[PDB]
Amino acid sequence: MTRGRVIQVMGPVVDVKFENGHLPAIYNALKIQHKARNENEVDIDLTLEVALHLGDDTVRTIAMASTDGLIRGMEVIDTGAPISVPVGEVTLGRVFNVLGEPIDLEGDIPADARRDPIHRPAPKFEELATEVEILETGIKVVDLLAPYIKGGKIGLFGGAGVGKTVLIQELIHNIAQEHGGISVFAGVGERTREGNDLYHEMKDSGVISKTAMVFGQMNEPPGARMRVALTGLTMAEYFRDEQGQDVLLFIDNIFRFTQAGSEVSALLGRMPSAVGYQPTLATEMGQLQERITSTAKGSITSIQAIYVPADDYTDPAPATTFSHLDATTNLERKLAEMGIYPAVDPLASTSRALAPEIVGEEHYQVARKVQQTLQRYKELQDIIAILGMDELSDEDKLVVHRARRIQFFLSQNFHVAEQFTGQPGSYVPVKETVRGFKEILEGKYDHLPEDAFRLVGRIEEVVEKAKAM
Template sequence: LNEMIEFPNGVFGLALNLEETEVGAILLAEATKVSEGDEVKTTGKLLQVPVGKALLGRVVNTLGQPLDGKGKIKTDSFYPLEKIAPGVIKRRGVSQPVQTGIMAIDAMIPIGRGQRELIIGDRATGKTTIAMDTIISQARLNKAAEDANDKDYRPLYSIYVAVGQKNSNVARALDVLEREGAMPYTTIISAPASDSATNQYLAPFAGAAMGEWFMDNGMDALIIYDDLSKHAVAYRQVSLVLKRPSGREAYPGDVFYLHSRLLERSARVTEEFGGGSLTALPIIETQAGDVSAYIPTNVISITDGQIYLETDLFYQGVRPAISVGLSVSRVGSAAQIKAIKQVAGKVKLDLAQFRELAAFAQFGSDLDAATKARLDRGQRIVELFKQKQYNPIPVEEQVAVMWAMQNGYLDPVPVDRVKEFQSKLQDYLETRKEGLLRSIREKKQLDEDLEAQLKATLDEFKTTWQ
């Protein structure tokens, strides 16, 4: 099973069904090159893809062949597409953060290195944008550490797997990553909608193999599967052609195993086995917000949490349109830096209460002072968490801005000027208080001295801001 078989004309296939009198295989090339009566040989090999740092900055297909016209990929290392996931003994707890640069996520739904965090929502709600922002944020951190010659910082390399996307979408993603300087740390694997179902089915496994190379060699990698709904559809196509019995929604019976064996390959392994990690951000597209459909429930149950994006919030202009009540990170809080925990502890509760109160406040005009204050604070939090795409915020600036909110500096600011206050504060910190930002970044927690500095800085800033 999963052995490569060879046809004449240099065409290869993959044996997926072994029966008494016949073998069911899928082709890895054009079907037109194969005809009845051709002699087929076994190769005794499993399907492999090239791996290593030579793939960074490149756009490749499912088999690791370049699509960007930049010449051959020079690497001697190959990994099999299918590999058994690390066992319990090999794994260790998630304790280092993946800083997405998106305030709402880093504060309330933190992601750790080695975690699997699902991004789920209807079409056009900003799922890919969250993934892109994360890649850009990490690339900036990698570059800053390189420039500062910081030997302690562990860079995070990214792999973006586009399954069943339009070619124009993949080109747009490439353009954004090149423009933002993230491509030197990123590999794009493209299996577009025009590609065969075989390639779309195999692409995420190729990405996982490339990511595992980093993990096995003591490095950290991030892989984005965009998206697993289309991956399941491609696998359904392959299975139906192979005449495997179909189950619910015509998916084959092992569609859960398809995704579980893929996502279980993401882990943080112990020093003994390299000490690296592979973080996965799978994306699932829902239909009309139905999270209880077959594939969404499967992937929710496999992952360590989900970021749920709501269409209603998106159209209200709350972007990223994260639903705080339905989003959760099961292991990420262990990876959050202490400074963020100190300033963001109450934010999630405040926001959830605000959403609840806002629904009731529509009906009654007479609100007591405490409720009114809570609604005012909630509106400001919502404004604060709105963010332009491809504009990740460094973690030390997030800490400063949220400290200002927690300590009432935003309360006198009109709601429609909160974003202006925030951007001016960030500019002020970057230009005049670089030392303070550096201290927060290095200490990773707020002590009395840093809090006093923050207070003095904000008092000073308040006098200049009008």
């Protein structure tokens, strides 16, 4: 029989003792439902993740909630599996904690629903996809200068008023519109009021009916914040595997995953690794980000926010995330104050997929000419500042006259911004933005005014916006 006794409680770490031979495996879930039998006790509903086997039939667990009220000798349910989290169409449009329970007040998920284990081994070498194919977003700065990958890890660099949530939300809308997939937002260790604001933005933008939210936030123990990306990822894996579609998987502040792992390691009593990180930093990051892959069934492509502490890109928590990333989309405050949406910095944003053997020769040459034109414009900024707009040369005036048209053609009208600006917003396929930037580079649209290029989708649409102005 799998009924155990609580031996030690010390903070978020609980030691539970079972009988011999009936020990729970590592990473299994252990429920404690204890109703108070008198006035000297506290009602407790609390689950535990098994972390070690200490010997003498004792098991060291980590806690998912507050351990206050626990008594040595309180009996523990062994569930016989890890944290089983509901999957399927019942999760789309719902907000969840790390246990797969609704934070929302809409209703409870029934007991007959399918629940997939939170800890799964990564898909094998024989199951992965051999070819690197491009996840087409319809956002021109993304799919022209830092192209995404089905099965790719992408770093959002920005936050605090540069349009990160709008970019996230437009990615959900475009992928669930054109590619037919869904999205999963996993808010790992990020504060409660930003989760509330993000919930109400996706509520009043219609985006939420095609996404599933998982919030494990700051007020929760470190074992609860560490398993958030895994319980959002096991929701993304249902639609990768059983449905066979291309899924987004947002992890807001992936650095909170690493530091929650460091806190669980410091509670478990392990000797610290380089700096303040756990010894298993690369192994925990690998067990996270090797399930975000493209198989023959579908894909999971993850857009992730990275904190980069101490402005240090060589700190081990940035340095082990960057070994899994494939693209970076630097969001800039200067492009947001200029009137360019999305605020993706075109020169700072790089991608591994921007290569002729992956996307093609035409896209590569157009994208590199756009990058060289914008780099030379940024170099000529100081000459225009100290010398004036005129009298530089003819070629410098021509490259400014093309580069400013380019840097305003990068912005789009979003479908999510339709509720604020009234214009419907556009999905721009990648052949049309390659053709549009090639025609801007060849001088086909020098005679049009440059404020027609701002916030418009295609190149025919800037033809009609210039003839309407």
